[PDB]
Every structure is written in structure tokens, then in C-alpha cells.
């Protein structure tokens, strides 16, 4: 349902989940469908542990999540049609490394 993740290139993604929009940043240190699925899982884990970020290991990666203040988020308004989406006031940076 999501655009393919950029395996080699770092990227910024805005994600709509429940009533919120989240700002994520992905940084990187063969079956790419599995890779995309586990990266989506990593995002879903970060979303499920918003307040207790810790590094974790997937089948192929170690993910080091970080949270930082989303500066000037008070100066933004996000809408889906007429619905107001609530921006989560923190940006998440996922440092993805290889599980050797």
C-alpha cells in the first residue's frame, strides 16, 4: 500500500496513521519485497513504541530509532479532504544497519 522504500538512498516520508501524520527519516549505512516488508514493520514498531524508542534487530537489519523535536510544526496544517490530521510533534529518524 506504500511506495517502495529506497534501499540505497536516504529518504523522508510522511505517514498517515489513525488521526495523525508522522514525519519519518530513513538513513542507511536481494529479495527486496521482504526488505520493504521488514522496513514497513520497523516503521510500525516505531509507531507502536513512540515513547520508548530502542534499537532492535530484524531478520536482516538493526534499526536504531531516534526521536527529535519537529520544529515549526505549529506553523503547519495537514488535511485529508476536509479532515484535519494531527501532526505528531516529533520527527523519527531510523538508522538502518546490516544484521551481520
Amino acid at each position: 500500500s506504500l511506495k517502495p522504500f529506497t534501499y540505497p538512498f536516504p529518504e523522508t516520508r510522511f505517514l498517515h496513521a489513525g488521526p495523525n501524520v508522522y514525519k519519518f527519516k530513513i538513513r542507511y549505512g536481494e529479495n527486496k519485497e521482504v526488505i520493504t516488508q521488514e522496513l514497513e514493520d520497523s516503521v510500525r514498531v516505531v509507531l507502536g513504541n513512540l515513547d520508548n524508542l530502542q534499537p532492535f534487530a530484524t531478520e536482516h537489519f538493526i534499526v536504531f530509532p531516534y526521536k527529535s523535536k519537529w520544529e515549526r510544526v505549529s506553523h503547519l496544517k495537514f488535511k485529508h479532504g476536509e479532515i484535519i490530521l494531527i501532526p505528531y510533534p516529533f520527527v523519527f529518524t531510523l538508522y538502518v544497519e546490516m544484521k551481520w
Binding site: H16, A17, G48, K77, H80
Partner: protein, 31 residues
Amino acid sequence: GYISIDAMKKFLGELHDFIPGTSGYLAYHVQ
């Protein structure tokens, strides 16, 4: 040793890319 992803809580609901100009999404800024 790090915690396995399978031992963690996961948001399982719908998750979409927020892309203004698509799917009715819009974003604004103060002026």
C-alpha cells in the same frame, strides 16, 4: 544483543503515505 523486532509492539492499522495533491491530501503554512 538487540531485541528481536518480533518481540515488539506494532501498529497494525492502516498506514498511508501523506502526499499533498494526492488522495485528497493537503498541507498549509502560516503567512
